[PDB]
């Protein structure tokens, strides 16, 4: 089982994952948080390395999760205040964020193998792994679960792949089928953020009265609040928040338990999303198979 | 007696050359033929072109191409320098053009492909051949193409342009005749375009007895396009000979053109196998020792199961699949009656909010004051910070600072340009350390350095 | 062996020396600006002089000394060890030497006006709109000439914004930075 897919990652560096030409944005710790989040949407990037001018080094990472945390953490009502985060700064928020616990920046050299990267993603439980050249100290690119899987299937030869892929997902037992973190169609966006902070989940598939998935609310989807300057009002439903793209997305990409792993991986990289919600004839929730599951099911 | 180098004795004269003349060598034993470039010490000592010749040999040494004259070795002595080269019988192309009059499409297309593969090889190796002409390209016994003279060539540095204007009067690009800064791919492409023209019409596209009228004829994009040939070639020549360097054809654009594709052997650009070794050779630095000399036998014998061979061949396959779905490594330009564009899932929110604004990057710091006056005003601020500078030319500075937190030092260059008569522009450029971990970013340090300077120039 | 050149004009020219019998004449061969020949000479120093148009004369281009007889002869050291390549030539910036680090003040002598901005740097890579289908983080392959050059975005805020496209071994990256005033 580990004969080929596991060897392949050890035989290639993270260097090969890095695009020929790419964009990267970085924020100084002295920069305000409000301005940093608006800079994200104008550039399209969902992650930026944090640079400290005093320490003269990269202190950490800034993702949409930080916009979620601060939105759920400092909030009173949709009308009354907005006060806490507007006058807040990155280093100031880092102070109250590290008040609870101290976690330093994790990064991997492009010379290190792809196996070392996927390890760092699971070991540290992190989606964004910035690759930084140790010789120059420059941040080249940000590794993502999406980037690795696409690279995996695209560059892997056809002789190694046929081993355990032909088996059905149900029978493989890959993914979390126990507690499915979801939200209703009428549940406020704030309580959705409340689930995002309570769990480590990257998305919350929304459900109707029946418990059927009619949409999905990703941790990426919350940045739209900043994009549209609607983050002030968090009392609105997730359906109202997802109403911005309602005429544009095709549907919710999902799979079935009886389907093969081979069919899942291919559909997952082709859709370019981070996860699929497995369902039945009734389209009720059964479980969720995130890229983390696929990647973690490979390393061991 | 008679002059000789190694086992090669010097014969009849081939030509005058750039620096010094060239003759034919003949092996005392076998009788092999080699072309030698004799550069006399006394002559080359006079001028400071010692670097001009240095760069040439440096580049030509590691050059292997069927249509690039391959430099075998360079022997030298207190008397004179020698460069042995591959000798060819056909002579220069201008002899072949004139003698044969005009060349047809079946032929001209063949030769142009060979020459363009040569200049492509050069451009990819970061070396430009400024003087391009049929008088500079030879032909072997099989009447193939061989690019000869590199004396007027140059090396392409990252983030650097070329000031020197060199080459023939008619073949010189519209930007180099005017004495303007250039990148260097475009100037060879324009020279290639007029070569393609001469390979067809038998006459030069831009020709005049009186100058600058020739240069004025060149500055204007006007040239005689006889009914001799089809419009496909004309559309190529027009796009290749475009007066605007930004609108000019790239090496790639010529590869994607129709007329060029027709009957084109795949041994020119390295995707398919070789007919009459490639960039994929540089996998060795990571895996093992230099290997260029050692594993030739490991890939010459067609043994693909060798530990060195199983590391080589799979690299060319890797680069082929990189082009397949190239949307992974490189971004694509924007998309007749064709609509469907399925956006990337992380691209969904922005296009909608736009249609249910302003982001524009300037070149650098821009100000309109006098050319000697501005640099002096800048030379104040550069000092004020406690950083230091050395000036090369009146408008060009080389500056650096000492890192406050570590004993490291980062530098940069400031070259002032003139965007128009009413305004000037100051350029900011990073640099590199000379050819174990670090807690600092060379890229960020450059920005902080500029930022500090810019803050004083503004406020 | 070794070879010698003669840069002065003459009708009939010969070369002599201490290697050959002190009276020996070696017929030289002709070229447009030079006259040369070749001989096999033993290891060591040497004293030689040219015979032109009937008169014994020396070449000022080469070194000169006084012999025991009191005449004027030249000096050459013949060896078999000179095949040299880089010894013959005897930052790493464009090779035109001039002064050094850490000091300067005011204008140079030269009155040359500043060079015109090349159209290459005016083409910006961040202002270019990518395709909608491809990844947002991707960008087109930049031109090598516009790599190191800085690109600053107009400061319409209290924070400075500036980027540059730096290259890696086979890859390119455009790094943007938001730094407060
Ligand atoms: O013939 C050999 C000789 O040929 C070449 O010399 C030419 C020279 O380059 C031209 O300048 C010209 O020479 C005329 C010269 O300029 C005049 O000055 C004059 O010469 C006079 C001398 O000034 C004067 O010194 C005298 O010489 C005496 C010496 O003081 C004395 O030492 C002795 O010389 C003997 C040496 O001691 C010994 O070493 C050995 O000499 C040999 C040289 O060492 C060797 O270089 C070579 O000389 C060449 C020379 O390289 C060429 O450039 O060979 C020599 C062997 O003979 O032997 C010496 C004698 O045994 O001799 C005298 C004692 O009286 O002589 C005159 C006084 O009037 O006239 C010169 C015109 O003829 O032309 C000559 C070529 O013709
Ligand atoms: N490479 C990293 N180094 C340090 N902290 C990180 C890193 N990646 C993510 N985080 C932290 O985890 C959150 C983002 O998680 P995620 O969106 O899952 O990658 C932020 O609050 C960060 O502080
Ligand atoms: N909505 C969810 N509720 C509970 N667990 C989830 C959910 N989504 C994903 N997971 C699990 O969390 C891991 C992936 O995390 P992430 O990449 O952050 O979505 C996988 O092991 C999944 O089985
Ligand atoms: N399983 C899915 N089905 C439909 N859309 C999805 C799915 N997963 C993610 N997305 C969309 O993709 C974006 C988030 O991508 P990601 O951060 O990679 O999960 C959001 O705009 C979501 O609406």
Short mmCIF file of C-alpha atoms in Angstrom, two decimals, chain C residues 39-142:
data_model
loop_
_atom_site.label_atom_id
_atom_site.label_comp_id
_atom_site.label_asym_id
_atom_site.label_seq_id
_atom_site.Cartn_x
_atom_site.Cartn_y
_atom_site.Cartn_z
CA UNK C 39 62.62 28.47 -34.82
CA UNK C 40 63.30 25.81 -32.19
CA UNK C 41 65.05 27.49 -29.27
CA UNK C 42 66.51 25.93 -26.08
CA UNK C 43 65.44 26.72 -22.50
CA UNK C 44 66.66 30.05 -21.14
CA UNK C 45 67.14 33.77 -21.68
CA UNK C 46 68.25 35.29 -24.99
CA UNK C 47 69.84 38.26 -26.79
CA UNK C 48 68.60 39.06 -30.30
CA UNK C 49 68.55 41.86 -32.88
CA UNK C 50 67.00 42.41 -36.32
CA UNK C 51 68.79 42.90 -39.65
CA UNK C 52 66.78 45.20 -41.93
CA UNK C 53 67.77 46.82 -45.24
CA UNK C 54 71.43 46.19 -44.37
CA UNK C 55 71.47 47.76 -40.89
CA UNK C 56 71.31 45.98 -37.52
CA UNK C 57 68.46 47.48 -35.47
CA UNK C 58 66.30 46.57 -32.47
CA UNK C 59 62.54 46.65 -31.89
CA UNK C 60 61.51 49.30 -29.32
CA UNK C 61 58.21 47.45 -28.75
CA UNK C 62 60.07 44.57 -27.09
CA UNK C 63 62.31 44.97 -24.00
CA UNK C 64 65.95 46.01 -24.51
CA UNK C 65 69.36 45.62 -22.82
CA UNK C 66 73.08 46.17 -23.43
CA UNK C 67 75.28 43.21 -24.36
CA UNK C 68 78.94 42.64 -23.44
CA UNK C 69 80.02 44.06 -26.81
CA UNK C 70 78.10 47.24 -26.01
CA UNK C 71 75.36 46.75 -28.58
CA UNK C 72 71.59 46.99 -28.04
CA UNK C 73 69.75 43.65 -27.93
CA UNK C 74 66.34 42.50 -26.70
CA UNK C 75 65.20 40.05 -24.00
CA UNK C 76 62.89 37.04 -24.19
CA UNK C 77 62.42 34.07 -21.84
CA UNK C 78 61.46 30.92 -23.73
CA UNK C 79 59.35 28.38 -21.85
CA UNK C 80 56.98 25.51 -22.67
CA UNK C 81 54.54 26.24 -19.81
CA UNK C 82 52.44 29.01 -21.36
CA UNK C 83 49.17 27.59 -22.72
CA UNK C 84 47.36 30.15 -20.58
CA UNK C 85 43.82 31.47 -21.02
CA UNK C 86 42.89 33.75 -18.08
CA UNK C 87 46.49 34.81 -17.34
CA UNK C 88 46.68 36.40 -20.79
CA UNK C 89 43.88 38.75 -19.73
CA UNK C 90 46.10 39.80 -16.82
CA UNK C 91 30.68 43.45 -7.38
CA UNK C 92 31.62 41.96 -10.71
CA UNK C 93 30.06 44.84 -12.55
CA UNK C 94 30.31 46.07 -16.12
CA UNK C 95 34.08 46.14 -16.60
CA UNK C 96 35.07 49.81 -16.59
CA UNK C 97 37.17 50.55 -13.52
CA UNK C 98 36.58 53.46 -11.14
CA UNK C 99 36.31 54.33 -7.45
CA UNK C 100 35.16 52.67 -4.27
CA UNK C 101 32.72 52.30 -1.34
CA UNK C 102 31.44 54.58 1.43
CA UNK C 103 32.09 58.16 0.20
CA UNK C 104 30.94 60.82 -2.31
CA UNK C 105 29.45 64.33 -2.62
CA UNK C 106 28.60 66.10 -5.90
CA UNK C 107 28.47 66.16 -9.72
CA UNK C 108 30.88 64.44 -12.11
CA UNK C 109 32.60 66.17 -15.03
CA UNK C 110 30.42 64.59 -17.72
CA UNK C 111 27.39 66.47 -19.07
CA UNK C 112 25.56 63.45 -20.58
CA UNK C 113 21.76 63.67 -20.11
CA UNK C 114 20.00 60.77 -18.34
CA UNK C 115 18.96 57.73 -20.40
CA UNK C 116 15.36 57.40 -21.58
CA UNK C 117 13.18 54.92 -19.67
CA UNK C 118 12.91 51.61 -21.53
CA UNK C 119 9.35 50.52 -22.50
CA UNK C 120 10.02 47.20 -20.72
CA UNK C 121 9.80 48.43 -17.12
CA UNK C 122 6.67 50.40 -17.93
CA UNK C 123 4.86 47.09 -18.50
CA UNK C 124 3.76 46.03 -15.01
CA UNK C 125 2.91 42.46 -13.99
CA UNK C 126 0.52 43.15 -11.11
CA UNK C 127 -1.75 45.46 -13.11
CA UNK C 128 -2.18 42.69 -15.70
CA UNK C 129 -5.42 40.75 -15.23
CA UNK C 130 -5.02 36.97 -15.14
CA UNK C 131 -7.55 34.43 -16.41
CA UNK C 132 -10.64 33.72 -14.32
CA UNK C 133 -10.27 29.91 -14.37
CA UNK C 134 -6.65 29.67 -13.15
CA UNK C 135 -5.50 29.96 -9.52
CA UNK C 136 -5.56 33.56 -8.17
CA UNK C 137 -2.00 33.25 -6.82
CA UNK C 138 -0.58 32.56 -10.28
CA UNK C 139 1.03 35.16 -12.55
CA UNK C 140 2.49 35.12 -16.10
CA UNK C 141 6.19 34.35 -16.64
CA UNK C 142 7.96 37.70 -16.14
#
